[PDB]
Design a protein around this nucleic acid. Structure first.
Lengths: 98, 76, 95, 149, 127, 210, 85
RNA sequence: UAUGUUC
RNA sequence: AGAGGUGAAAUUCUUAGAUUUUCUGGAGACGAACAACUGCGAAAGCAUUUGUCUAAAAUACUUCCAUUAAUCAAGAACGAAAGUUAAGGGAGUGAAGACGAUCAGAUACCGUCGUAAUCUUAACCAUAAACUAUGCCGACUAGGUGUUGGAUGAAGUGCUUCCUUCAGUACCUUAUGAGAAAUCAAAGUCUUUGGGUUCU
């Protein structure tokens, strides 16, 4: 029961809060500093994961290494396409912050 | 003679008149003087109102409560 | 016409029981059906006990026991007299 | 029991008193707001009722207010598009299929997945016989993993 | 002074091996069995054959020097049978009456924790 | 035979008798030095005979001949096991037997495998016919006994572990640790075997013999 | 509509060779010509290029695999034992 | 716990 | 200097050292004693440890829905053993086969050996006295002895037993209940014949 809870919180944020999936959108969001959390799939290419991590370290935004690949992250978000990169512009009524 | 039966307390649930075995109680921790509502056979963990303390441990039955304190039925 | 209520074995709430092998003939027999005798015997008789205890040392030697735990099929048990045919009414009695 | 054996009569029996308990001087002017906030925070109505009974001491929301919890959720528009029990069954089926894909040798898991999908089809048929589910709802097993939404 | 050997007794419903070695189990002192004391091609397991088998090894041990013996009792094997043959009784009896001292006695018949399949089919021996 | 000469067998310092037996080899018609034949010989001798007490008659120790000078072999601890008759005696119908095993290494890098056994208790006011424990209780007991064995075999050397094997100080500890979960009757280290030993150190063998 | 009842891709062989031989070759051609999951991009688009080489159409990255499948049970088990430690 | 047909 | 094996033998192994003793390494199968008129599973079936994944059931519930249910032609999943296909494995056992015995004969029972098979993987096959020879759901009808898993209340020493109850699971007795009877707490509540349903 280690991925189920984070999947449930993701369900909650997709339902309530606003978000953005995709490398360009997440990079822009946490460039402007609107990113509260960034989720990286285990499948993410090494260079782009390192770019995301450096960007988030600069922007003081947390990074969560998703346990699944982009395929599982897409289904966790409820989409029918691979994601590999998530930014949450604001959390809804979810406890994903603690 | 099943109409005026009286000692059916030891009878299983859904006796002649099905009544639950659970109840509700007010708990007072010693030296804390707080009032809160509690459910016998509770399934979650509860916290006090005045000072945050542990009250009951949710098990398969009527919980364990604490070593001291006073718990009283809310039945009128 | 169903000689025994239990069908000759002790299977209930169960589908299959692994078989064991008769100690006398080697026949496959279900464990719940095999006749089991746990033999705790002396290594020798009383006369040989009286011989080797006095021929032994420590002056308090106690001979070990033999723990066998044999199991037999119905035919072998009947032939070796571990069980009798018994009468129809006496057939119910176990102990 | 629908499948297998065992009667299992374990359940909860409501008290004879239909009305609000006398000791509850609490006013129902905010109990619906409490359940609405809890659902917004994200709870299925079953666990909403459980949390209400345990942490709030207000058993039988129907007794406190003459309207039941999923009904007030629908009236406020919070109720999910898929009913609770059907969604839980779908989640169980998704988990079972995910496990089976790795372990195709789990014949017992395959059997119980068949049973769960039979239950899913029966209850979905009921829910779409009622207007609680769109008439074209099918539950194909390919995209049920994301159908939870 | 008391000098100890180890007599492995093998009683297997056929000839009764009587095998005295030193404490380590190697460097065997004497091995008599029961097939040489009888020449009827039978009675190899007989109590009588075991008796002479035992007194012969007792005499050889007396002349060799060892005076006390530890019994290691063994029955057939893990798959064949678990009970000692008829010869173990008389082997121990004659070893006792021979005058050489007896120390500790132990059963060491190979006990299979496993269950490798034994001879004959699932219908067993029909004789 | 005529070309065989006796040899004396010695036991380590922590035992009582210090001489348990005699061995014989063949002469040294040199291609074999008649000392390599003696080396690596295992002697199975009862704890009763090694400590002059009948109470320990159910344990037999294996001593492995490791060093030879003049005419007496010296040997060292090689393993232990409880006797078959006692093992069978302490197994009765109506009780559940719990067995556990663990691999440990001492501070001397002595790799051991220890097998312990335990049985449940009737206690006084049971008034029942069986003392079966649930599978969860059995698992907890086995985990507890494995942890106790590994701790009490890893914190110490080999000589003191052998010394504490004599009073069965580990069975008592397992008893007192499992009392609060499920009462256990006679529980003992059924067997200990040496999986691997370090390179032979004649210095240490002699400081433990003296 | 359904074109061949059971021969499937082996309908290219007509009646030649044995039925057992055709069924055996079908079993392995099915997985030789299948697309596999590319663990580097997550898209099921890695196809066989030569006998032991598998290339992903998206990554353009190629891996060494089985003759007819991306992975073989022996190699998978060996990797499992290695990764256990 | 050798074998031992038929009317 | 015999060893195996048998009712007795013989085939067989054995001075090149058989059998036997001890040690080391490898291999495959199996998982004893505990082990039960005990547990789990739809059935077939499931017994070394630990971890992970997965499901089920009972119990407790003042939690949710509110008839969503019962049984089912067709249809579908699973389905012991043997058998088939292809790789691997191959110790022990061992359909075939070969010998040695017994016998009037013995191609059998007994003994020695031994191919396929048994084991794993991936597919087929879909059958068993696959049996409690007893379809599934529901109601009612009687006392006792147990036993497995929960929950309730109380008491010997924080810990153990007794009471009640639910759900399993057996057994004993009893029928002015049934049956042809054996027997059956269901195979009863059937000429005082109709709770529902499928198959034969």
């Amino acid at each position: 029961s280690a991925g189920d809870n984070i999947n449930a919180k993701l369900q909650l944020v997709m339902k309530s809060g606003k978000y953005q999936f995709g490398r360009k959108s997440c990079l822009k969001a946490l460039r402007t500093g609107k990113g509260k959390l960034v989720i990286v799939s285990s499948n993410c290419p090494s260079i782009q994961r390192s770019v995301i991590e450096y960007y988030a370290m600069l922007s003081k935004c947390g990074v969560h290494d998703y346990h699944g690949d982009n395929n599982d992250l897409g289904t966790a978000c409820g989409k029918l396409f691979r994601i590999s990169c998530l930014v949450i512009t604001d959390v809804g009524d979810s406890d994903i912050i603690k | 003679n099943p109409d005026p039966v009286e000692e059916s307390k030891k009878h299983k649930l859904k006796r002649l008149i099905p009544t639950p075995n659970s109840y509700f109680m007010d708990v007072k921790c010693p030296g804390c003087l707080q009032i809160t509502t509690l459910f016998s056979h509770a399934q979650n963990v509860v916290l006090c109102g005045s000072c945050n303390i542990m009250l009951c441990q949710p098990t398969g039955g009527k919980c364990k409560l604490t070593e001291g304190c006073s718990f009283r039925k809310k039945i009128e | 016409p169903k000689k025994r209520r239990n069908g000759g074995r002790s299977k209930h709430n169960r589908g299959h029981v692994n078989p064991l092998r008769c100690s006398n003939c080697g026949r496959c027999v279900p464990k719940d059906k095999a006749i089991k005798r746990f033999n705790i015997r002396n290594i020798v008789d009383t006369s040989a006990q009286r011989d080797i205890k006095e021929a032994s040392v420590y002056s308090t030697f106690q001979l070990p026991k033999l723990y066998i735990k044999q199991c037999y099929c119905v035919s072998c048990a009947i032939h070796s007299r571990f069980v009798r045919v018994r009468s129809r009414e006496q057939r119910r009695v176990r102990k | 029991r629908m499948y297998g054996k065992g009667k299992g009569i374990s359940s909860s029996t409501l008290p004879y008193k239909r009305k609000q308990p006398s000791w509850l001087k609490q006013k129902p002017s905010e109990i619906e707001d409490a359940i609405i906030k809890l659902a917004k925070k994200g709870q299925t109505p079953s666990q909403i009722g459980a949390t209400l009974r345990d942490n709030y001491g207000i058993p039988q929301v129907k007794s406190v207010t003459g309207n039941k919890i999923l009904r007030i959720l629908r009236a406020q528009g919070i109720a999910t598009t898929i009913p609770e029990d059907l969604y839980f069954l779908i989640k169980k089926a998704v988990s079972m299929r995910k496990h089976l894909e790795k372990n195709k040798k789990d014949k017992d898991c395959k059997f119980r997945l068949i049973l769960t999908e039979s239950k899913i089809h029966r209850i979905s048929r009921y829910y779409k016989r009622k207007k609680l589910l769109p008439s074209n709802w099918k539950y194909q097993s390919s995209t049920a993993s994301a159908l939870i939404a | 002074e008391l000098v100890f050997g180890v007599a492995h007794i093998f009683a297997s419903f056929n000839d009764t091996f009587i095998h005295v070695t030193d404490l380590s189990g190697r460097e065997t002192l004497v091995r008599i069995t029961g097939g040489m004391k009888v020449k009827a091609d039978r009675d190899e397991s007989s109590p009588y054959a075991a008796m002479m088998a035992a007194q012969d090894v007792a005499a050889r041990l007396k002349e060799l020097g060892v005076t006390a013996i530890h019994i290691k009792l063994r029955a057939s094997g893990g798959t064949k049978s678990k009970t000692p043959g008829p010869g173990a009784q008389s082997a121990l009896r004659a070893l006792a009456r021979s005058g050489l001292k007896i120390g500790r006695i132990e059963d060491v018949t190979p006990i299979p924790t496993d269950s490798t399949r034994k001879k004959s089919g699932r219908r067993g021996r029909r004789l | 035979f005529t070309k065989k000469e006796w040899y004396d067998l010695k036991a380590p310092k922590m035992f009582l008798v210090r001489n348990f037996g005699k061995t014989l080899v063949t002469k040294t018609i040199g291609k074999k030095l008649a000392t390599d034949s003696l080396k690596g010989r295992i002697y199975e001798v009862n704890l009763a005979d090694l400590n002059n007490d009948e109470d320990q008659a159910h344990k037999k120790i294996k001593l492995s001949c490791d060093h030879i000078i003049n005419r007496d072999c010296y040997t060292d601890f090689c393993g232990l096991s409880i006797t078959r008759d006692k093992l069978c005696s302490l197994i009765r119908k109506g009780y559940t037997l719990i067995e556990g095993h663990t691999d440990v290494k001492t501070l001397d890098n002595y790799h051991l495998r220890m097998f312990c056994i335990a049985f449940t208790k009737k206690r006084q006011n049971q008034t029942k016919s069986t003392c079966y424990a649930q599978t969860s209780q059995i698992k907890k007991i086995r985990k507890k006994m494995v942890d106790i064995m590994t701790a009490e075999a890893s914190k110490v050397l080999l000589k003191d572990l052998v010394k504490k094997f004599i009073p069965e100080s580990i069975g008592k500890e397992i008893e007192k640790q499992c009392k609060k979960i499920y009462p256990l009757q006679n529980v003992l280290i059924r067997k200990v075997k040496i999986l691997k030993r370090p390179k032979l150190d004649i210095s240490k063998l002699m400081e433990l013999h003296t | 509509s359904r074109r061949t009842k059971k021969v499937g891709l082996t309908g290219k062989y007509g009646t030649r060779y044995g039925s057992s031989l055709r069924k055996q070759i079908k079993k392995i051609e099915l997985m030789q010509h299948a697309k596999y999951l590319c663990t580097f991009c997550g898209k099921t688009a890695t196809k066989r290029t030569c006998v032991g080489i598998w290339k992903c159409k998206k990554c353009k990255r190629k891996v060494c695999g089985g003759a007819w499948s991306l992975t073989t049970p022996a190699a998978v088990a060996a990797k499992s034992t290695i990764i256990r430690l």
